Every structure is written in C-alpha cells, then in structure tokens.
C-alpha cells in the first residue's frame, strides 16, 4: 500500500503496488491504484479509494468541458488547482485524499501532489504510502535527476521491492507506468514474487 | 398574489409627477388645519365636524398624539392617517431600542418621509392626500414640521393647511410677529378657525391639542370652551 512518483531527464515515473486490504486480512490482490483520466494523463490513489475515483471523474469533467470550451488542453497546474480547493471544502467531514497528479505540461515536465488537508505542491519527487520510509529512504540515497529511462525502471522497481520486503502492507503485483511528452507509456505489470527471484536470485 | 410593485407613476413632460399633483389637490381640498410654534410650546387646532348630529367627539378623534411629548395633526383622509400613525408608533420603538431616550421632532420627519418617498418609487399606490403636521418639544425649543406627499418638509412657526390655506396664512402673517405665547397662539388659532367657520368657538366642532416643553398636553373640548366661550 505504497506508491512513488518522480520526474527525471525524460518524463515522469508512476509506480504503485497492487496489495491494498482492510487490516492484515488478505482480500484483494488486484487493487489498481493508478487510474487513467485522459490518454495523456495518469492519476493515483491515496487515502479513500472512492474519493480518488470520484474526484478524478470530476477532474476529467472540468478538463474535458474546458477542452470543449477553448479547444485546448488545460495545464495540469490549473487542472488540479481548483480540484485541491473543491476537495478541501469538505475538510473535517471525514474525506481524506492524498493523491498525486501525474502527466505532462506544455512548459515541460511536471509533477503535482494534492492533499485533502490543502497541501498542493509541484516538485521533483513524491511518494505516498506506508512503505514511504523505504521508498523515500533507499531511493534518495541513490537517486539522481540524470538517470535514464531504463535506470528509472530499475530504481523504481528496486524502491518498490524494498517497500514490499519488510513492510507487510505492500505486495501483490508491481504497477509501473511511465509518462512522456506525447503521452504516458504503459510499461509493465509484474508480480512481487517474480521480481523477488530477480533481485534476490 | 401578483406582486408587481412597478413604479407606474412616472415623470410628466414638464418633469413633475402628475399623481403627486393630484395628491396636493387632495390636500388643497382638505379640511382646514393650522398649528403655531411659539415660545414654550406648539398649539394644534384644525377642525372636525360630523356629517350629522349622530356623531360625537368623545370617542373618535382626528388628532392622536404620536407620543406623550409629541403630538400630530394632518389634512386629508383619516384611514390613511391612522395607517402612517400606526407605522409612526412602530418606528418609534426602532428608535427607542438603541437610544432608550425620547425622540427629537425632526427625527420622525426624516424616517417617515423616507418611507413615504420610498412608497412613491414603490409599487401600488402613493402617499395619497395625507399631509402630516409633526410637532413636539425638545432641547428647550419646540418644533412644528409639515411634509408633503413627495416628502419635502419645511420648518416654520405657523402655517395653514387644507382649504383656503393661502388666505388663512396671509392672515397669520400679519397677526403673528416676533414671538407669541400659548394663550396668544390659541387666540389666533380661534382667528384662523373663524376663517373657515363653520364651527369655530364651539367646543364640539373643534379639538385643541397643545405641545409644551413639559410634554404634549391633549385637552378635552371642555378646555376648548374654557379658553374660548368668551372667545377672544
């Protein structure tokens, strides 16, 4: 139950794990945190799952309607900007949305991190989950902005695998997608046990 | 209901309001009314005469004071007189809540004429033909005020209203000079009541209120026969 998002020399990286349940009981291994909004955009899932799904439908609503207004794709900054405030109006009622907004901006690479508490920031690296201490920690020790695309897959798969090792909230399959200028490129979906035979042997 | 509230009374080609001109015509065809602000207090007289002998002055009054220290007279119809009086009594509490003190004379004229002028721009009917005479005593110097349907109010010592308001006032201009007392104000009030008389000098054909710096005093027709019997 931990993800990571970072941008590098080419595009942005979207990684997620497929194990999300209630408590320690094994229930659903098919949970997909990465949700498609537009063919050129990608969403995430944090906190409430249905809140992430619904508010992404409203996000796609305002983006597509505006896309039918000026006949132009709106910037991701101005997209989730009002989304941060509209979700923030429900603060205190129990809604918690920690999702990250991924995609490409006309001015260049970008990444956006939105919180129901009202934190919205655009920066290089962001990760949400229980294994974030392993995600952030072991990656930032070896992280660099100059990494290649294949090296980004290796470090993302490594940081996700380290999050699935000791932490019991992570497991199932590894969801790893990549973002590019023309559009985000679907990469692969691999099992954690299969990648265990890769790194460990 | 409908709830149109449109302004239908509009500007004449000359710029005035023809409906308000009809309003001042209802005042000009109104009952003779006069009041005198002199020295200590104000005196109100006007006239009330029944259509027959079947009516008496002991119950229904044309002069109802707005407060204990503030009296009021008027010209025109009584039904709309008691309507604006009812609003004047209510509005007196909107003042008294904040102040917790009695009210100045002109303080009523400001808000009453504002609601009256609002009732012009507002839909339905207008100020009609009721021209109210507001009087009272405050700050040691009493006051006598009168407004019109359009809301224009002026201050003076004395005036005549209703029918023959120009002739009776020209008589009051020569009689009233410098200052006068309450007894002298009532005396020339008999003179302006004898102008259109009819019912002057008789206690049952008129009603006399008097404002004083000690507060307004409304005397029964008994005192009207006391001072004037014996008139002048």
């Amino acid at each position: 139950t931990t993800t990571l998002a970072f941008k590098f020399r080419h595009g942005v990286i979207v990684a997620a794990d497929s194990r999300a349940t209630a408590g320690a009981y094994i229930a659903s291994q098919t949970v997909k945190k990465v949700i498609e909004i537009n063919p050129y955009l990608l969403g995430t899932m944090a906190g409430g799952a249905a809140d992430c799904s619904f508010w992404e439908r409203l996000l796609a609503r305002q983006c597509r309607i505006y896309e039918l207004r000026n006949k132009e794709r709106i910037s991701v900054a101005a997209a989730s900007k009002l989304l941060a405030n509209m979700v923030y109006q429900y603060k205190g009622m129990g809604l918690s949305m920690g999702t990250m907004i991924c995609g490409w901006d006309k001015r260049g690479p970008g990444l956006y991190y939105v919180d129901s508490e009202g934190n919205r920031i655009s920066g290089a690296t962001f990760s949400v989950g229980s294994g974030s201490v392993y995600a952030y920690g072991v990656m930032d020790r070896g992280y660099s902005y100059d990494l290649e695309v294949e090296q980004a897959y290796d470090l993302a798969r490594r940081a996700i695998y380290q999050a699935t090792y000791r932490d019991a909230y992570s497991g199932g399959a590894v969801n790893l997608y990549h973002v590019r200028e023309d559009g985000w490129i679907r990469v692969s979906s691999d099992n954690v046990a299969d990648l265990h035979e890769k790194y460990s042997g | 209901e409908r709830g149109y509230s449109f302004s239908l009374t509009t500007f004449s080609p000359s710029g005035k309001l023809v409906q308000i001109e009809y309003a001042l015509a209802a005042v000009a065809g109104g009952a003779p009314s006069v009041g005198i602000k002199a020295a200590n207090g104000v005196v109100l007289a006007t006239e009330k005469k029944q259509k027959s002998i079947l009516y008496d002055e002991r119950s229904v009054h044309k002069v109802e004071p707005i407060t204990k220290h503030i009296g009021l007279v008027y010209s025109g119809m009584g039904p709309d007189y008691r309507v604006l009086v009812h609003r004047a009594r209510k509005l007196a509490q909107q003042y008294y809540l904040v102040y917790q003190e009695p009210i100045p004379t002109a303080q009523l004229v400001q808000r009453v004429a504002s609601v009256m002028q609002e009732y012009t721009q507002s839909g339905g009917v207008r100020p009609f033909g009721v021209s109210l005479l507001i009087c009272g005593w405050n700050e040691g110097r009493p006051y006598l005020f009168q407004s019109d349907p359009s809301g224009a109010y002026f201050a003076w010592k004395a005036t005549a209203m209703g029918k023959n308001y120009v002739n009776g006032k020209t008589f009051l201009e020569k009689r009233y000079n410098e200052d006068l007392e309450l007894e002298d104000a009532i005396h020339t009030a008999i003179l302006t009541l004898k102008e259109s008389f009819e019912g002057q000098m008789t206690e049952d054909n008129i009603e006399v209120g008097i404002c004083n710096e000690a507060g307004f005093r409304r005397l029964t027709p008994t005192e009207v026969k006391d001072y004037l019997a014996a008139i002048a």
């Binding site: 000026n70 709106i74 910037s75 900054a77 101005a78 900007k81 | -």
Partner: protein
C-alpha cells in the same frame, strides 16, 4: 421579482428594442483600432470636453490587465458595468488558471453574459458595444467585436462607430500588408485614420499604443502635434 417581456420575436426576423438599440451604438462617437505584430493601436474622437477642466477620468479605454485593453462605444453606464463585470472575470481568471486572460475566454464571457442578460425577463440589454484590442500570449495579436446579441468575430482591422462604412472605405490604404512595418508607420496609419475619422481634429483626438509586453502609454498633446505635423506635411510631400 419583476415579470414582463423585454422584447418579443417579430416575423421580420429580429427583435425590436434590441436590434434597434444598435442605433444607440450607431449614434455614438467614432472608435477604431488596428492590430499589429509589433504594436497595437486604437483611437477615439468626439470627446466633447470643455477643455477648461480635467477630462482624464472620461477616458474611453481601460485595462483589465496591462496586456488587455478595452475599447467600447455607446453610453458610459453600460460600459462601466462591462468594465466591472469583466474585472470580476479577469480576476476570477487571475485566481483560477493564474496566467492572464485569453481573448476567446473574455469575449465568450462578455458576449454570452450580455446574451443571457438579454434572455431572462426584467433585464434590459446594454445599449453599447465593444471591440477588444491587445496582444495574445506568446506574442500573437488579437482583435474581436461584440454585438448586442453577444456575437464575437475577429477582423483584420477595427472600424466601427459613427461612419463605419466611411472609415472602412478609407481602410483601402490599410489593406496593404506592409502596414505596419514599424511603430512609426502604425501611428502614421492611425494619424491618417484619425484625420479622416471623422469630424476631428487637433483636440478631441484621443488614442494610445501598446507594443508587446510594454504597457500601454498615452502620449501628451506634444508628439500628437508631431504626428499631425508629418501627416499634414505628407500631403505637401506627395505633390
């Protein structure tokens, strides 16, 4: 509230007091404008000032943003409402989507608001029109129009107001693609336009220019005499 029919549809194909309220724009002062790749310009005349007092506050061109210029015709009251309403729009588009306002977004607001302002009962249409002059983002220019029915259309050059066909016939020299190769040629183009449009001149002429990111500037009655000097001398140079 207030229920009544503003205007009803006549078989002649248009409404009455709306399409005939275009005469309120037709009886207004002459106003024109010219877009350019370097500097955008406009103009207005018939100020009717007393010349003994301060006329600076009757100015017919305001700015929502430094890059946005508002040029209107007709009465002032509905123009000021268009100002403040577009100020609410440009400020709302300042809060949301922080970058400045595109011309299609502000024209859609101004035109369609006036349209829906003509739709609901108890709302009388504006007796005014307007045309936008400025520069789009990334260096592109802009000009559009507004209609009492709220329709926006982009021309190559702006000629409206009193004598719209007279100034448009004078644009025969403006149809040249060489205009304007420089800012001095653009002001000389407005000089020839303002001299022809319409009654003029020497006093009531009021205009301004804006080039790229540089904010608009209103020249004093000094260089205006210089542009009028070389324009009047050009007739002597053409002999």
């Amino acid at each position: 509230s207030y229920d009544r029919a503003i205007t009803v549809f006549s078989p002649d194909g248009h409404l009455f007091q709306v399409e005939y309220a275009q005469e309120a724009v037709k009886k207004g002062s002459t106003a024109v404008g010219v877009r350019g790749r370097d500097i955008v310009v406009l103009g207005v005349e018939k100020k009717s000032v007393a010349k003994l007092q301060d006329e600076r506050t009757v100015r017919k061109i305001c700015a929502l943003d430094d890059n946005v210029c508002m040029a209107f015709a007709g009465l002032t009251a509905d123009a000021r409402i268009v100002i403040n309403r577009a100020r609410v729009e440009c400020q709302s588009h300042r809060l949301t989507v922080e970058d400045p306002v595109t011309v299609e977004y502000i024209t859609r607001y101004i035109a369609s608001l006036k349209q829906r302002y003509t739709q609901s009962n108890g709302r009388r249409p504006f007796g005014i029109s307007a045309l936008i002059v400025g520069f789009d983002f990334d260096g592109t220019p802009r000009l559009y129009q507004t209609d009492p029915s709220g329709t926006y259309h982009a021309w190559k050059a702006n000629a409206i107001g009193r004598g719209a066909k007279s100034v448009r016939e004078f644009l025969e020299k403006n149809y040249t693609d060489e205009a304007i190769e420089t800012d001095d040629l653009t002001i000389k183009l407005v000089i020839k336009a303002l001299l022809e449009v319409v009654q003029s001149g020497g006093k009531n002429i009021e205009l301004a220019v804006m080039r790229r990111d540089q904010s608009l500037k209103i020249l004093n009655p000094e260089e205006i005499e210089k542009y009028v000097a070389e324009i009047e001398k050009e007739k002597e140079e053409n002999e």
